[PDB]
């Protein structure tokens, strides 16, 4: 497999696994490196998060609307939207927003609960048709990534084929399925990560994980080229050491890679 040798040569060099999977929805061309392993979502999985909310505003009138006036019993670590607002609360719209473009995680266990926990959100992506994607645990219990452990996973090629349906494709009502590429193209987590493979005049959406231990860290996204279809891609890493330092630089590379080979 000629196209796999760049990634192989990567993730050696990085000391772990590299799984890719990008689509031009145009074409249909692919680029494929362990795209149906598992990997840890981390905080990957806020998008699909923040998705899940919209959808279930479609059927609730006034629920994005809605303020929710949380506790400092709902804080957790590396909150700083939901701590910033404690004093005032937050929409369901603005927490969802909080989770996807700041990472921030008592937003996002704020909509878990919303949605009847990580079982919740797991039976949404199965009802879009994802067999793959699992949610387990709550933030931050979420990200210990350890290897063999298929809690709080899914796979490169799921990912990218789930965000294709909810970003660009029938999964979401028109007007919830724009309101999730805007929280995405707002994100303020992934400047090093995809963001970074890409030439400056595309337009860019995506979410970042970072469990950190055990070389693990992502970002998903959807790229709009300058003349061309929308391209959507994944970017997983992992390895096997508790140890071993995930790396931004070579999620990057392999978007590089990814955008070369369509
Ligand atoms: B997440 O579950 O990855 C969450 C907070 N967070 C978001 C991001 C990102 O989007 O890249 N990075 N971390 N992780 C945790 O709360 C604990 S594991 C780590 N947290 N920060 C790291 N750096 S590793």
């Not at 799984?19 to 981390?42: I, K």
């Not at 806020?46 to 929710?68: E, H, M, Y």
């Not at 949610?135 to 090629?157: F, K, M, Q, V």
Request: net charge neutral.
């Amino acid at each position: 497999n000629l196209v796999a040798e760049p990634f192989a040569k990567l993730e050696q060099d990085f000391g772990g696994s590299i799984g890719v999977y990008a689509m031009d929805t145009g074409s249909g061309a692919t680029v494929s490196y362990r795209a149906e392993e598992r990997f840890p979502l981390c905080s990957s999985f806020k998008g699909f998060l923040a998705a899940a909310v919209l959808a279930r505003s479609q059927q609730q009138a006034g629920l994005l609307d809605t303020p929710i006036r949380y506790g400092k019993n709902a804080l957790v670590p590396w909150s700083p939207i939901s701590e910033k607002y404690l004093t005032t609360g937050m929409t369901v719209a603005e927490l969802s927003a909080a989770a996807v473009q700041y990472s921030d995680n008592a937003a996002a266990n704020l909509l878990l609960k919303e949605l009847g926990g990580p079982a919740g959100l797991t039976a949404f992506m199965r009802s879009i048709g994802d067999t793959t994607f699992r949610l387990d645990r709550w933030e931050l219990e979420l990200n210990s990534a350890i290897p063999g452990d298929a809690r709080d996973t899914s796979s490169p090629r799921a990912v990218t084929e789930s965000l294709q349906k909810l970003t660009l494709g029938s999964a979401l009502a028109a007007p919830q399925r724009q309101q999730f590429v805007d929280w995405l193209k707002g994100n303020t987590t992934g400047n090093h990560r995809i963001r970074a493979a890409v030439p400056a005049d595309w337009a860019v959406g995506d979410k970042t994980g970072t469990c950190g231990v055990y070389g693990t860290a992502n970002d998903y996204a959807v790229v709009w080229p300058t003349g061309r279809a929308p391209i959507v891609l994944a970017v997983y890493t992992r390895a096997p050491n508790k140890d071993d330092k995930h790396s931004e630089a070579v999620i990057a590379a392999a978007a590089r890679l990814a955008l070369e080979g369509l």
